[model samples]
Target chain A: PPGPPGPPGPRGDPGERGPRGPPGPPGPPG
Target chain B: PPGPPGPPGPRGDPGERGPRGPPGPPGPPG
Candidate 1:
């Protein structure tokens, strides 16, 4: 218990994990 | 105010990351 380590905590609400699938929609612009 | 909120901004410098490959036959955007 050092009690001096707390400055890294704002980006912490995306732990449920549900992303990595929608990469199939925009094509043909060449 | 410009260097702190910048290090936590690396979701990756990838914009032209495109390549899902095809879905078009729209002959002419009219």
Candidate 2:
């Protein structure tokens, strides 16, 4: 095989996403 | 005796529209 590949730069931080992750602090009283 | 009718009583009254009173006197000044 070729030389060991890097970890893809930590996955490039998931592409600066909109980041709708798990429920966190008060996300407003919508 | 049926005293001769004083006069032809008015038929049914009209739509009685447009009761807008005269322009009220301006009661304000800043």
Candidate 3:
């Protein structure tokens, strides 16, 4: 997602990507 | 007064003096 504007001067470098979440839980029973 | 030391490497430049304060109130009655 886009972050707030930085202080005066050129835009800052993009932040590092966050860690991926664990695998999704099993689906509901059929 | 002596201030806290700066991060590792050469000493950093002294910070700018803070803004002057307003005149203080009168002292308590004699």
Candidate 4:
């Protein structure tokens, strides 16, 4: 009774997993 | 401060490991 690990492919694009670059578009509102 | 869950997609085909039919021959054993 061990059959449940096949169906995990469609969770990409967490913004390309960014972290320290491309944080643009938020410094012109002052 | 939370990023580390993206990079896992290449581990399939355990051959449905034991228990049912259609598991297919162990192949020509002498």
Candidate 5:
């Protein structure tokens, strides 16, 4: 469990123990 | 400006470059 993505950092990253850095491709924002 | 996300990170850097964790895929749109 990497600590810094948000143990609910500020207003988000309210995760419940999952995986990350696993999706970094097929990028788009709209 | 490929940098740490959510700009508000100097305690949480509040950047104005207007780009971020790119918008999508954590599921549940209901």
Candidate 6:
């Protein structure tokens, strides 16, 4: 579900249900 | 870790984990 990532304002907006804006790349694996 | 098993002695207390009792040793590690 869409939720705030952490305490600080998330880097990105509460992106639309599907893909996001600004079209960022994928994040690194854990 | 896996739930606590039986105690080595005759009886044991209710472990926070699970299965607890005095298991009868039928034979050496099979």
Which candidate number maximizes DockQ? 1
Q: Is the docking of candidate 3 incorrect, acceptable, medium or high quality?
A: incorrect
lDDT of 4 by residue, B1-30 (tens): 544455556654433233332333343333
Over A1-30, each residue of candidate 6 has an lDDT whose tens digit, in order, gives 333333333233332333222433455555
lDDT of 2: 0.36
Candidate closest to the true structure, highest TM-score: 3
Candidate 3 TM-score restricted to chain A: 0.40
Off by more than 4 A, model 4: A1-30, B14-30
Q: Candidate 1, after superposition: displacement of residue A8 in Å?
A: 1.4
TM-score of structure candidate 4: 0.17
The clash count for each model shown is: 0, 0, 0, 0, 8, 0
lDDT of all predictions, in order shown?
A: 0.40, 0.36, 0.44, 0.40, 0.38, 0.36
Per-residue C-alpha lDDT of model 2 across residues B1-30, encoded as one tens digit per residue: 333324343354343333433444444444
**Index of the highest-lDDT prediction:** 3
- Two-way DockQ contest, 1 vs 5, winner: 1
Tell me how each candidate scores on DockQ against the true complex. Answer: 0.10, 0.00, 0.01, 0.01, 0.03, 0.01
Model 2, C-alpha of A2: deviation from truth (Å): 99
- Weakest ten-residue segment in model 4 chain A by summed lDDT: A15-24
> Per-residue alpha-carbon lDDT of model 2 for A1-30, expressed as tens digits?
444433322222222324333433433342
Error of 5 at A3 (Å): 14
User: After superposition on all CA atoms, how large is the RMSD of candidate 5?
Assistant: 20.7
Rank candidates, TM-score, best first: 3, 2, 4, 1, 6, 5
The alpha-carbon lDDT assigned to residue A6 of candidate 6 equals: 30
The TM-scores of chain A alone, one per candidate, are 0.17, 0.16, 0.40, 0.18, 0.15, 0.23
Tell me the tens digit of each residue's lDDT in model 3 across A1-30: 333433344333544444444544555565
